């Protein structure tokens, strides 16, 4: 957990859900990210997918909104470190509903940044790598 923040990271310090840490902007982003409706706990199964991580994995919509929230924040240095630790180190994935992937378009470092699909079959929930910060 970050010095001066309540919500950013596993576990939490806060007493009420309305309470925010030192930084008005970064802690709001982390609070919104930690209140994602659809998550998957460690070892939880949902939507035909099983996550095999000790940390909870979240939906790609929450991660995209969290990315935009951190990139548009006013306090640059705290949001910078939170983004560079969450998105770029742990090598997590996000799950969303998409046509079945046929192959990876562009793979840079250990992650696929553009993928390709078959438009012929229906949509299914699948894992996708997270963009870097």
């Amino acid at each position: 957990i970050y010095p001066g923040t309540l919500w950013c990271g596993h576990g939490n310090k806060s007493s009420g859900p309305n309470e925010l840490g030192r930084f008005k902007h970064t802690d709001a982003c982390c609070r919104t990210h930690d209140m994602c409706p659809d998550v998957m706990s460690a070892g939880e199964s949902k939507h035909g997918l099983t996550n095999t991580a000790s940390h909870t994995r979240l939906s790609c919509d929450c991660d995209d909104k969290f990315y935009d929230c951190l990139k548009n924040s006013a306090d640059t240095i705290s949001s910078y470190f939170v983004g560079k630790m969450y998105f770029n180190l742990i090598d997590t994935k996000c799950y969303k509903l998409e046509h079945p992937v046929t192959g990876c378009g562009e793979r840079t470092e250990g992650r696929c940044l553009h993928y390709t699909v078959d438009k012929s079959k229906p949509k299914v929930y699948q894992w996708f790598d997270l963009r870097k910060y």
Partner: nanobody, 127 residues
Framework: QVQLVESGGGLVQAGGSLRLSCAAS????????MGWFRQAPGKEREFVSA????????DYADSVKGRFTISRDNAKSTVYLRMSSLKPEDTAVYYC????????????????????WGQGTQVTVSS
């Protein structure tokens, strides 16, 4: 704030060659993929081409594979769509689009991948 502006277009005879150029401004250019979308009168604005930030992966729509070429100049922050051997049923409005900021990986085969769009220029094949 960002600004995407096109150049090129108009009427050209069947078989002729034309390239549209699209200049972006406001942010870093090389990070974000960019693409070109084709809207015929009375149809969904479908994508015709897209190119990644690095340039190493491009995706073309099946209707136009092998006739169009896509490229970018990161120093001038521009993207070029070259077109050759134009055929009927290809006259349309061509829009220039840029990949928005995303936390997850996205496909270039979707409208929802691109946030910033230009006004686009008309392309007319007449003979």
């Amino acid at each position: 704030q960002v600004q995407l502006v096109e150049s090129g277009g108009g009427l050209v005879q069947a078989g002729g060659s034309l390239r549209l150029s699209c200049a972006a401004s406001g942010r870093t250019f090389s990070r974000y993929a960019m693409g070109w979308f084709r809207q015929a009168p009375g149809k969904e604005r479908e994508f015709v081409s897209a190119i990644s930030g690095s340039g190493g992966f491009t995706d073309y729509a099946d209707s136009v594979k092998g006739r169009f070429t896509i490229s970018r100049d990161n120093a001038k922050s521009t993207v070029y769509l070259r077109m050759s051997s134009l055929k009927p049923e290809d006259t349309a409005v061509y829009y220039c689009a840029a990949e928005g900021s995303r936390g997850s990986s996205t496909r270039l085969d979707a409208r929802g991948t691109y946030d910033y769009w230009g006004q686009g220029t008309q392309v007319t094949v007449s003979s």
